[PDB]
Amino acid sequence: ELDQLRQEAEQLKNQIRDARKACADATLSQITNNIDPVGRIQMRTRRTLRGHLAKIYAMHWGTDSRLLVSASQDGKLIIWDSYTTNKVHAIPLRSSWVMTCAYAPSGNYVACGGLDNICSIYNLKTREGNVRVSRELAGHTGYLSCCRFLDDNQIVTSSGDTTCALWDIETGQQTTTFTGHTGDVMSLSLAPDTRLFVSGACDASAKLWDVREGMCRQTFTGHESDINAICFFPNGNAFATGSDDATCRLFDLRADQELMTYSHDNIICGITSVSFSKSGRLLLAGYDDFNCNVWDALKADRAGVLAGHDNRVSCLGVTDDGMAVATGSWDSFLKIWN
Amino acid sequence: TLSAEDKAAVERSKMIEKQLQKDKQVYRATHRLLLLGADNSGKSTIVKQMRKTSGIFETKFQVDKVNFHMFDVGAQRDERRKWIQCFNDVTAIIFVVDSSDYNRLQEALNDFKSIWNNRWLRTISVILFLNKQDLLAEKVLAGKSKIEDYFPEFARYTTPEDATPEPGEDPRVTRAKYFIRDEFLRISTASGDGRHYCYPHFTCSVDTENARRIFNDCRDIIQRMHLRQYELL
Amino acid sequence: SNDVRASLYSLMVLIILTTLVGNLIVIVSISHFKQLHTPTNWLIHSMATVDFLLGCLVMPYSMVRSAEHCWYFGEVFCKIHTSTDIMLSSASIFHLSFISIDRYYAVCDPLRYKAKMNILVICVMIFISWSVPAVFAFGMIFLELNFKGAEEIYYKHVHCRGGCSVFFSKISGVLTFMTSFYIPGSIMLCVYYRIYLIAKEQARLISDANRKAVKTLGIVMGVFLICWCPFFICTVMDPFLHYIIPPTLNDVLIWFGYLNSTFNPMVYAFFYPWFRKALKMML
Amino acid sequence: TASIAQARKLVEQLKMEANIDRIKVSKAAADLMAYCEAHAKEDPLLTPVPASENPFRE
Amino acid sequence: VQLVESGGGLVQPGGSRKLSCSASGFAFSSFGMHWVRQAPEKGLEWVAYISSGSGTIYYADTVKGRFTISRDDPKNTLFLQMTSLRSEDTAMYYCVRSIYYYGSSPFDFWGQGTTLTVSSSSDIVMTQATSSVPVTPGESVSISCRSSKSLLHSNGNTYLYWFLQRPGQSPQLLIYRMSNLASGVPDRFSGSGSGTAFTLTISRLEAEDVGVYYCMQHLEYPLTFGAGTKLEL
Ligand SMILES: C[C@H](N)Cc1ccccc1
């Protein structure tokens, strides 16, 4: 029974591969050759935020394009003001191993969680003048690796037990769960329509998840090593992807193909974070070699270097209005580049 | 600080700075230790004696005014690669091992070999523990199960002259105990090139003095680190 | 004759330039980089600042005084020169002693190194090192305490030779010795003997489980014990005995002191691997 | 048998995956640069906006 | 949350008294504290201001070296001591809560107040065009506020507060920064201006709108107040 049950599986995925192969006519580069190159960006370090004790693990830009939130492993979650370099709030923590932060689109709640297998919800704007935990969410076996806000009452969490789970704060239980990943998923990104989201586990594959019905829709492969960072495209019909083999790739939802690959042999370290630009011409990509290069999105030619970090770069983020980019590192120093 | 609002904002920032520097002063004089190991090993007993799917069961203890943090692992998955690089500021690793099973020994050696060769877990010393000595002694007295059943190399082995047996202790027990000890130490000395040092120990829980052992091991570890930093070693 | 003087000028100016350049590299490397903000690096930076100020405030005038036996600067600047000499030499010695104490607190109480050797104590050390020599020098120099009891002796000694000297006395000389060279010279010896013993026993333990300490300790102690010791021995023996000493001996002794000043930042900074790595990354 | 149950789910997933329609890569690339060039005015990262903007002065 | 005060009464001139505004139900150690003065037959006036960390202390230009303030963080109590009281120093005193950071809404909460009876320049000046107008429940009501200087700041913030105290209770907040709505007010009030004169508009009028409106400015230390426009239906 097992021998025959599989044979149709190989036949069907072979048919899928044949359909995928016989669906391409050209790559992006040969069609984009007739484009004026991008030119040197020459970014400068406008600011340098500091005050963290241990090494930063994540950061997230507020919707107002003025506030940002950072979480480090010393058990602290500070909220800065990116223009005047002040400190709005400084929230302590219960678990000293936090690797996730998320600032709500409205600007009310902050969520963070790590090896404790719990996402906490903090209520910034209260009648009280103190930030207090709202509702701890439990139900994941492994460590939580990413978390995003669909709405003000619908958080989405990506865990280490190979199961993603859509939550509901007012009720307080998983209204939907996702299965289909062998490895532990370590990346989560939301579509601009908030109707879909993709994720990438350690088995070198990414899958598209339909939020409403609550199950997968598409699968994406093409990487050798695990996946450390994923991010959509501003149009919403593409998404970049990071890995550990010094290669970051661009994928297509509509065509279900592998369009373009970004790689240069002078770098052997791994991509740690990927973020796009509000226009889509650039593709930022941090590296373990202490460097944060800038990749052109249409020609694969490097368009400048943003060195200046004394240790590993862990997280990036482009501004919502698109005027600045912030990189966090393991040397406990946030830098507001521009 | 042009207006009054910015003055109040920088006042609030100054208060936050004072709180953060106080927390840094509290944070800078504490030593953090992992507690890797296994299941049949007496993690629960020892962690209670120092005195829900949560993945961290952190415990604190104090000896001679020094502060140690016991980051005991919890109900995670068997895979141990993506949350191990997070531990690079720790001082040592207490690798508890059970030595009264005769069959989990090989898996324990495999686990120790995996821990002693991780790229991230380099320049981190290991404080190995042996546990359940009384059970091993009783098994030696009982007979039946033998090391030769699983490890045939025990017979062609003699106790080292460096052994320091306690009163009693039929020297067959000593031969076996030092057999496991030498196995773990040869696994440790297989690599390392003098950048992190193993530290074997012979405990049995049941309120035997252990915090002193971690204290002495950490003192030696930090002293050797400082001596190496100043080109004195 | 003239060739000897020209060679003397060449040697002295070479020493001055070496002092300035090496200390400037030390100051710049410590000040610029953000990873080198450990408090012991603050001590090294302060010591470098002291040595550089000595180099750029005293050395040319001692050059012109020693080259030709006369003082074409008047009475007003001689007191400033002697005060600056005593101030900055004592500052260097005190900084070296405090570095030794900090190093001792690292390999003898390793579980509480960062719990007590924080930046407040380092700032206190820098303030004391800059402050106590100031009053200790100005009191004898400007308030006329060294010359008491030997006024005519000082007058005949300064006028039988060229430029103004640093003529000490009996009780003032012995007090200056015991305050500025002895009590900062025994702390180093005791600390480094303890550290040598500990390094030896730890190395022997590690070897039996299965050199550098002797070399580094010797290169740190020999530089300081070969420069100040002859000058401070002669200066304290001169008033106890009769003043039978060629003036050129004082010149070579003070030049040995300045040579210690130029050697200090090549020993306490460049000899270590992390600082060399940072400097090489800079270039 | 647990193993055959997993195979059924895997085959169901593959059959569902074999349902999506696809288009030519040329249309996708056309959409990409069409979006890219049209919204190239509001890119303060690529084209330096004058000193009036960039509230990150000093 | 609630603010309670004790004291009051009639005091002969030249004496001294100590009154307290006790706070309970919030974090008193993270809120700036203010004081206001309002005669029973006149408008509102500023008194003092104390920062959260007691590092910035401001006083009214009328009384600078005579009035004194004090706070007690463990007990969440705040004290005022009166020295050489005068007959003119007879009005209503309120203790007002405020917290300052980006996006905050200062002067949000108000206390109950106490009654004190005594027996018998180049700063920005502001005025109100009208003092009493007749309106009807269902038409539009517009009130104008005018200042003597352009309040627009380099950052881009125009500082304007409206309170609209009702006849019988402490005042509230409706609009801050001339454009931002308050917390619990209905979506019926708005404000606009060009930099010199400000206007307030109300869409619908109900029985809850009966009261007197106050116009406020916050640019410098003096913290000038308005006159007031009583509404009669
Ligand atoms: C080298 C100085 N001219 C002599 C001196 C005397 C006492 C202490 C330090 C230095």
Q: Do B231 and C271 touch (CB under 8 A)?
A: yes
Interface of C with B in 109-168 (CB under 8 A): 110-115, 118
**E126-226: what CATH class?**
mainly beta
Q: Do residues C232 and C181 touch, judged by C-beta distance below 8 A? A: yes
Q: State phi, psi for C145 to the nearest 5 degrees.
A: -105, -30
Angle, CA of A12, A13 and A15, to the nearest 5°: 65
Q: Do residues A230 and A181 touch, judged by C-beta distance below 8 A? A: no
Which ranges in chain E are annotated with CATH 2.60.40.10? Answer: 2-118, 126-226
C-alpha to C-alpha distance for C189 and C186, rounded to whole angstroms: 5
C-alpha to C-alpha distance for E163 and E173, rounded to whole angstroms: 5
CATH architecture entry for E2-118: Sandwich (2.60)
- Is A325 touching D (CB cutoff 8 A)? yes
Q: Which residues contact C56 (CB under 8 A, 6 or more apart)?
A: C20
Q: Which of E59, E100, E158, E178 to substitute to test the interface with B, most B CBs within 10 Å? A: E100
C-alpha to C-alpha distance for C257 and C235, rounded to whole angstroms: 13
Angle, CA of E59, E64 and E67, to the nearest 5°: 90
For residue E225, which of E71, E92, E103 has the smallest C-alpha distance? E92
Instruction: List helix spans (H) across B116-210.
Output: 133-142, 147-150, 171-189
CA of C195 to the centre of ligand 1 (A): 30
C-alpha to C-alpha distance for B117 and A205, rounded to whole angstroms: 28
Which residue has the least CA distance to atom 5 on ligand 1?
Answer: C86
Domain ranges of chain A: 1-337
Q: Do B9 and E157 touch (CB under 8 A)?
A: no
Identify the residue whose tokens are 């007739």.
Answer: A34
Identify the residue whose tokens are 């801050």.
Answer: E176
Contacts of A160 in chain B (CB under 8 A): 76-77, 82-83
Query: Pairing between strand E114-118 and E92-98?
Result: antiparallel
Method: cryo-EM
Identify the residue whose tokens are 């014990």.
Answer: C225
Angle, CA of C120, C279 and C217, to the nearest 5°: 65
C-alpha to C-alpha distance for A281 and B72, rounded to whole angstroms: 47
Identify the residue whose tokens are 């409205």.
Answer: A106
| Distance (Å) from the alpha carbon of A88 to chain E's nearest alpha carbon | 6
Q: Which residues contact E154 (CB under 8 A, 6 or more apart)?
A: B2
C-alpha to C-alpha distance for A50 and A69, rounded to whole angstroms: 13
Angle, CA of C202, C204 and C209, to the nearest 5°: 95
C-alpha to C-alpha distance for C246 and C251, rounded to whole angstroms: 9
Q: Do residues C232 and C240 touch, judged by C-beta distance below 8 A? A: no
Q: Which residues contact E50 (CB under 8 A, 6 or more apart)?
A: E32, E33, E34, E56, E57, E58, E69, E71
Three state DSSP letters for C140-185: HHCCCCCCCCCHHHHHHHHHCCCCCCCCCCHHHHHHHHHHHHHHHH
C-alpha to C-alpha distance for C14 and C11, rounded to whole angstroms: 5
Domain ranges of chain C: 2-282
Of the CA atoms within 13 Å of residue E63, those in its CB half-sphere come to 19
Identify the residue whose tokens are 């010591």.
Answer: C47
How many structural domains is chain B composed of? 1
Identify the residue whose tokens are 């038409």.
Answer: E139
Three state DSSP letters for chain E: CEEEEECCEEECCCCEEEEEEEEECCCHHHCEEEEEEECCCCCEEEEEEECCCCCCEEECCCCCCCCEEEEECCCCEEEEEEECCCCCCCCEEEEEEECCCCCCCCCCCECCCEEEEECCCCCCCEEECCCEEECCCCCCEEEEEEECCCCCCCCCCCCCEECCECECECCCCCEECCCEECCCCCCCEEEEECCCEEEEEECCCCHHHCCEECEECCCCCCCCECCCEEEEC
Region of residue A241 (left: phi > 0; alpha: psi -120 to 50; beta: else): beta
> Tokens standing for C74?
């008047």
Q: How far apart are the first and last CA of chain B?
A: 53
**Which residue of C254, C261, C262 sits with most ligand 1 atoms within 8 Å of its CB, as the best mutation to test the pocket?**
C254
Which residue has the least CA distance to atom 3 on ligand 1?
Answer: C85
C-alpha to C-alpha distance for A185 and A165, rounded to whole angstroms: 12
C-alpha to C-alpha distance for C105 and C113, rounded to whole angstroms: 6
Three state DSSP letters for chain A: CHHHHHHHHHHHHHHHHHHHHCCCCCCHHHHHCCCCCCCCCCCCEEEEECCCCCCEEEEEECCCCCEEEEEECCCEEEEEECCCCCEEEEEECCCCCECCCEECCCCCEEEECECCCEEEEEECCCCCCCCEECCCEECCCCCEEEEEECCCCCEEEEECCCCEEECCCCCCCCCEEECCCCCCCCCEEECCCCCEEEEECCCCEEEEEECCCCEEEEEEECCCCCEEEEEECCCCCEEEEEECCCCEEEEECCCCEEEEEECCCCCCCCEEEEEECCCCCEEEEEECCCCEEEEECCCCCEEEECCCCCCCEEEEEECCCCCCEEEEECCCCEEEEC
For residue A254, which of A233, A274, A275, A273 has the smallest C-alpha distance? A233
Q: Which of E3, E102, E154 to substitute to test the interface with A, most A CBs within 10 Å? A: E102
C-alpha to C-alpha distance for B220 and C104, rounded to whole angstroms: 16
CATH of the domain at B189: 3.40.50.300
Angle, CA of B33, B36 and B42, to the nearest 5°: 110
Q: What is the CATH number of domain C2-282?
A: 1.20.1070.10
Can you state the percent helix, strand and coil of chain B, rounding each to 5?
A: 40, 15, 45
CB-CB: which of A86, A127, A130 is closest to E1? A127
Neighbour count for residue E96 (Cβ, 10 Å): 22
Asked whether residue B15 is domain-assigned, the answer is no
> Tokens standing for B89?
């500021």
> Tokens standing for D19?
């349902």
Neighbour count for residue A195 (Cβ, 10 Å): 12
**A1-337: what CATH class?**
mainly beta
Domains and CATH numbers, chain D: 4-56 (4.10.260.10)
For residue A183, which of B81, D11, B86, D15 has the smallest C-alpha distance? B81
One-letter amino acid identity for A15? Q
Q: Do residues A68 and A47 touch, judged by C-beta distance below 8 A? A: no
Domain of residue B173: give its range.
27-229
